[PDB]
From Swiss-Prot:
It is found in: Host endoplasmic reticulum membrane. May form homohexamers. Interacts with N protein. Responsible for the cleavages located at the N-terminus of the replicase polyprotein. Participates together with nsp4 in the assembly of virally-induced cytoplasmic double-membrane vesicles necessary for viral replication. Antagonizes innate immune induction of type I interferon by blocking the phosphorylation, dimerization and subsequent nuclear translocation of host IRF3. Also prevents host NF-kappa-B signaling. In addition, PL-PRO possesses a deubiquitinating/deISGylating activity and processes both 'Lys-48'- and 'Lys-63'-linked polyubiquitin chains from cellular substrates. Residues 1-166 form the Macro domain. It is a multi-pass membrane protein. This is Papain-like protease nsp3. Inhibited in vitro by GRL-0617. The chain holds residues 1026 to 1191 of 7096 of the full protein. It catalyses: Thiol-dependent hydrolysis of ester, thioester, amide, peptide and isopeptide bonds formed by the C-terminal Gly of ubiquitin (a 76-residue protein attached to proteins as an intracellular targeting signal). The gene is rep.
Length: 166
């Protein structure tokens, strides 16, 4: 199957009201982005959902990556297997502004997307990371230069983002 049902916001940013796990299972994209933390502990939010859909195979692989490589930096990324969801999973760490991490690092986090021509992704630093999701979409539009297909689960949030960008 291929991406379908997206609204084009800019030349390269698309958005859909969808569960990213279901999108990944339908499309099997080359790259799905995870909203990760520095130790790749996929406990909740989008990370918990993607790891559960791999039946914990992502967590076991992530623990081995950390033991061998050490933690990521805030604003950084690594490429690991996508298992049943994608060819690859790009684990990206946005700042957790509720813990005083600098919002400037949200631009650095989105810069990692430019290494891939096409990605399925969530908004970074939204949810438990504490950033305003509309601000995160603005940074995505201002920073990502490759084609990104954004999945937003919550309908109320999705409608607010589309109203702000149209
Ligand atoms: O897209 C959303 O509505 C947002 C979040 C979320 C959280 C958990 C999810 C689990 C499965 C699939 N999608 C998810 C999405 C947290 C911030 C905004």
């Amino acid at each position: 199957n291929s991406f379908s049902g997206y609204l084009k916001l800019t030349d390269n940013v698309y958005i859909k009201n969808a569960d990213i796990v279901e999108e990944a299972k339908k499309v099997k994209p080359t790259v799905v982005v995870n909203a990760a933390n520095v130790y790749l502990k996929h406990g909740g939010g989008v990370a918990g959902a993607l790891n559960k859909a791999t039946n914990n195979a992502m967590q076991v692989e992530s623990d081995d990556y950390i033991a061998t490589n050490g933690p990521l930096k805030v604003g950084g990324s690594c490429v690991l297997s996508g298992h049943n969801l994608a060819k690859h999973c790009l684990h990206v760490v946005g700042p957790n502004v509720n813990k005083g991490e600098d919002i400037q690092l949200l631009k650095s986090a989105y810069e990692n997307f430019n290494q891939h021509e096409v990605l399925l992704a969530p908004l970074l630093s939204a949810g438990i990371f504490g950033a305003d999701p509309i601000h995160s979409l603005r940074v995505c539009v201002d920073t990502v230069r490759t084609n990104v297909y954004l999945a937003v689960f919550d309908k109320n949030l999705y409608d607010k983002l589309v109203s702000s960008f149209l």
